[PDB]
Amino acid sequence: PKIHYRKDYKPSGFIINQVTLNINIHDQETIVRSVLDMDISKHNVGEDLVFDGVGLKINEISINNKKLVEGEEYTYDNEFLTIFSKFVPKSKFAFSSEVIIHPETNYALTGLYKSKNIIVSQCEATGFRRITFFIDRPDMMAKYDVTVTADKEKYPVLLSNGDKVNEFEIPGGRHGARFNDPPLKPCYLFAVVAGDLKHLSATYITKYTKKKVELYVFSEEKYVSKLQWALECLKKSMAFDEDYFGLEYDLSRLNLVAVSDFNVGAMENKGLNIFNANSLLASKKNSIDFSYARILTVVGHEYFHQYTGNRVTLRDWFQLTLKEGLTVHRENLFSEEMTKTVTTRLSHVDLLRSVQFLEDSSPLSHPIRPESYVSMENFYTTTVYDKGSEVMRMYLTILGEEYYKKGFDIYIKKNDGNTATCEDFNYAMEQAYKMKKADNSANLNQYLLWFSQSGTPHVSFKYNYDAEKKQYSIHVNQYTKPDENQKEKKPLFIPISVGLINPENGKEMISQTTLELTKESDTFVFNNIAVKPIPSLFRGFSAPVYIEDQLTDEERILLLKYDSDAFVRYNSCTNIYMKQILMNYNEFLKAKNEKLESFQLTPVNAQFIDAIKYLLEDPHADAGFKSYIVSLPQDRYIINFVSNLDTDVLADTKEYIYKQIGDKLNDVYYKMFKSLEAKADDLTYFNDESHVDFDQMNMRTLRNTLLSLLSKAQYPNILNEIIEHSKSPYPSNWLTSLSVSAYFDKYFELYDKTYKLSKDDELLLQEWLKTVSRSDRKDIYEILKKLENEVLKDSKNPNDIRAVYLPFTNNLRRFHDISGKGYKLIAEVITKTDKFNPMVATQLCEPFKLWNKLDTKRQELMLNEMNTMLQEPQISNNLKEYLLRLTNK
Ligand SMILES: N[C@H](CCc1ccccc1)P(=O)(O)C[C@@H](Cc1ccccc1)C(=O)O
Ligand SMILES: [Mg+2]
Ligand SMILES: [Mg+2]
Ligand SMILES: [Mg+2]
Ligand SMILES: [Mg+2]
Ligand SMILES: [Zn+2]
Missing domain, CATH: 3.30.2010.30 (Zincin-like)
Incomplete structure (x- = not known):
């Protein structure tokens, strides 16, 4: 189990100039012939020539058309091909090989594999070595000349990188295509596709x-x-x-x-x-609304990689965030512009602060540039991607649009034909920073800590207003908790986008201001502030931090109603919810701990409830924003604020708060649900394939959120609405009707109805599976067994497996059943999946990420399941490393 260290980077003692591939696809096997035109680099010290090569069946290998003999001149161990130094030429040479691989039984979905009736490759990060021998690392840039041959009837469409320069018939019903791609590329960007497409x-x-x-x-x-x-x-x-x-x-x-x-x-x-x-x-007939935003983001993301990833590539895998963080940030700018809704930004922040903040406070915590890995496939994380994106977005906040565009252009132009590191990007931004600050002594050396320091900074505030002086002060503190990566944490360069709200009229009191916090603490003073303001802090969520605003609930309600910034409004609401959750949770827990026969709960703030009503009745407010405010924070956001979290107590806490609010607002919820119908469900453009209205989709999100609240509340005659909702042409509506019927005797009626609607479209079926899996059913364990026996069976399709099991793990009450049966269920699936797909087994571990944040009993139950998994004789390297890290061993 080799550990790879960032600090150990060295260029290879070899060069690969040209790859010439012949991929011959047959019924029971694929034959891969490869010639590597190679050289000796300046860094060479007379070492053996070692190729990566995993699971390859060797027919023959040669050097300069002379066949090599096994044992005497080379060894192969199913992982590494070693050709002994004395047999390696001292100038330019050709290495050739012919290997057998078997895409049909490649269930790990890395290298060359069969997906239904399509042969397809996946080479990032380490999949090319599963196709043929190579020095499989992104700094080995080469030209590619690739020929694919196959049965014409089965595989009429043949694709690879570059220009298709020849097409030809082959005897015996076969055909071929040659593709030449002269520009240099790393091997993880090689691809081949064969199918009836x-x-x-x-x-x-x-x-x-x-x-x-x-x-x-x-x-x-x-x-x-x-x-x-x-x-x-x-x-x-x-x-x-x-x-x-x-x-x-x-x-x-x-x-x-x-x-x-x-x-x-x-x-x-x-x-x-x-x-x-x-x-x-x-x-529109066969997809949930979510698919539309998802395709926009994924197509966008992949397209933006062409520059940030493909044209400017990585020196090494430790630089992963250089392409992933930056591309997610480019995709975020794109989606914000395309969707023209505040929920695009809000949704990314919602994901970061729930999922990524959890990762950063867990034993899996790492910087966006890790110092080491065993399995690189384990580092395609929310931290590298989503915190990386926030680190990339902070440059734009610090520089503004003009100077950001200038620095980005410097980065592209300076690095276009080559590999790059995180320092190359920071360097380009620093050039823009020097220009913006109007002095060449200015630097971004401190900014580099965002790349190296793990953990989420906590940013806290204290205020002072002098009415006589018209002087307002914001004292700011920053603190990152010590962890396994750094004993001593350092202050980061934190941009804090701020406004000041006049509480008397709701107006901005200052121009747009970004406070540059570069020390552990600082005091920012403002003159000619005519009245005591309410500070609007970290607008746009301007840094990836825990915000401790120290505002009263009155001040937060005012920002929620009156502030100009969507995030600060969403965060003020979030903060009001959190104070309430923590209070009621501690009240429930004390009652449980002390075995009380009676006790009190603190009610939800009535002016907060009035503010929610105000916002919902506002015709100008965004429907997507509205759906957030009626929803309590994610369980995975909450867990960052509670030690030894008792999941039953949290469940009772959420239930109480939702009941409190609904008791006041249910009539308003019902009124809105009915009044929104016309615009939300408008069918005018249903048969227009290209007409996509994100506002309308957010309106359906709101309607379905409200329906969920009303069904949980058992609102009078709400089952009538549920049944009518099941007759909607939109899957987001009729699948919602399934989930909300969970509370009624008509659940299995809608189970059968919606299954029949879903079964003939692969993707829609997987959406139906997710909806069943996430259903708030007391008999959910029996239902998952029904899903297994009747639908999932022994599918090895990751979409099917993830759809059946992952949504269930968000069922707070039931997944965390005190018997441990939910934990045993997922561990069984993880272990079973690990035998064919280590990557997906690793993904199926997500529920265990918070194991050490739960109450004592559940902590022991989860750890037991993780130790049981680690004991498995055939455990993958991927799963073993992930669980060893997660359990602090
Ligand atoms: N080249 C990246 C990952 C490829 C990979 C596959 C298997 C093992 C290791 C690496 P990606 O395009 O960033 C993949 C993105 C796709 C994506 C992009 C934007 C939003 C959602 C998903 C992801 O799923 O994380
Ligand atoms: Mg093999
Ligand atoms: Mg144009
Ligand atoms: Mg997004
Ligand atoms: Mg299928
Ligand atoms: Zn990507």
Whole structure:
């Protein structure tokens, strides 16, 4: 089990200049012939030539067309091919090999594998070595000349990177295609696709150079009608990169391909992007609303990788955030501009502060640039991606749009043909920073700590107002808790976007201001402040931090009603909810601990409830924003604020708070649900495949949120609305009708009805499975068994497995059953999945991430299941490393 250390980076003693591949696909095997045109680098010290090569069946290997002999001249251990130094040439040489691989039984979905009737590769991070021998690391840049051959009938469409330069018939019903890709690329960006693929296509003309680019979107025949939105999103992505960044696509064709079996969302293979079908395919009849935003983001993300990942690549895998953080940030800017709704920003923050904050306070805590790994596939994390994105977004906040665009352009121009590190990006931003500050002594050396320091900073505030002086002071403190990565934490460069609200009229008292906190603490003073303001802090969520605003509930209610910034309003609401949750939780817990026969609970603040009503009745307020305010914070956000969290107590706490609010607002909720129907469910453009209205979709989100609240509340005659909702043409509506019926005797009636609606579309079925899995059912364990026996069976499709099990793990009451049966269920699935797909087994561990934050009993139950999993004889390297890290061993 080799540990790879960031500090150990060294260039290779070898060069690979040219790759010539012949991939011959047959019924029971795939034959891969490869010639590597190689050289000795300046860094060479006479070492053995070692190729990565995992699970390859060697037919023959040669050096300069001379066949090598096993044992005497080389050894192979199924992982590494070692050719002894004395047999390696001292100048330019050819290494050739012929290996057998077996895509049909490749269930790990890495390297070359079969997805239904499509042969497809996945090479990032370490999958190319599963196809053929290579020095499988991103700094080994080479040209690629690739020929794919297969049965014409089964595999009429053949795709790889670069220009298709030849097509030819082969005897015995076969055919071939040659693809030459002269520009240098790393091997993780190699891809091949073979299948009976149908397509839509368009032509895009670039903004400045007026180049014609052919756009092709591919899928299985059955689902080709679902490709239209993806095509629109691709065009949008190209336009945005041209409009915001002045960046044009450089190649003559871009292919997007949907496959049914995929470990993640998608993959940015150069000119040949490959997608989880759930992230490319959609129709209004057969997709939930969420699919539309998801496709926009995933197509966007993959397109933006062309510059940030593909043209400027990574020196090494420790630089992963350089492409992932930066590309997520580019996708975020894009989606905000396309959706024109505040919920795009709000949703990313909602994800970061629940999922990523949990990761950063867990034993798995790491910086966005890790210092080490065993399995690189374990580091494609919410921290590297989503905290990386916030670190990338902070540059823009600090610089402003103009100077940010200037620094980004410096980065692209300086690094376009080559590999890069995180320091290269910081360097480019510093050039922009020197220009903005108007002095070349200014630097961003301190900013580099965002790359190296793990843990979430806590930012706290104290205030002072002098009425006589018209002087307002904001004292700010920053603190990161010690963890296993750094004993001593250092102050970070924290941008704090601030406004000051006049509480008398709700108006801005100052111009836009970003406070630059660069020390452990600082005091920021403002003159000519005419009245005591309410501070609007971290506008836009301006730094990835715990915000401790120290405001009263009165001050927070005023910001919630009157502030201009959507995040501060959402956060004020969040903070009001958290104070209430912590109070009522401690009250419930004391009553439990002290075995009380009677006790008191503190009611929900009545003026807060009045503020929610005000906001909901406001015609101008965003429907998506409205759905957040009626929803309590995520369980995974809350757990960061409670030691030894008793999940039953938290469940009782949420239940009380929801009941308190609904007791006052249920009539308002029902009135809104009915009044929103017309615009939310409008069918005017249902048969327009390209017409996508994010406001309307947020209106449905609100209606369905309200319906959920009313069904839990058992509002009079609400089952009538549920039954009518099940007759909606929109899957977001009729699948919601399934989940909300959980509280009524008609649940299995709607189970059968919605299954029949879902069963003939692969992706829709997986959405039905998620809805069943997340259903608030007392018999949920019996239902999951029904799902296993009747639908899931022995599927190895990650979409199916994840859909059956993951949503269930958010069932606070039932997943965390005190018997440990929920934990045993998921561990069994993890262990079973690990035998064929280590990556997905690793994904299925997500529920265990908070194990040491729970009450004593549940802590012991989870740890027991994790120790049981670690004891498994055949455990993967991926799963073993992940669980060892998570359990602090
Ligand atoms: N090149 C990346 C991951 C590829 C990979 C696959 C298997 C093992 C290791 C690495 P991606 O395009 O950033 C994948 C994104 C796709 C994505 C992008 C934007 C929003 C959601 C999903 C993801 O799922 O995390
Ligand atoms: Mg094999
Ligand atoms: Mg344009
Ligand atoms: Mg998003
Ligand atoms: Mg299937
Ligand atoms: Zn990416």
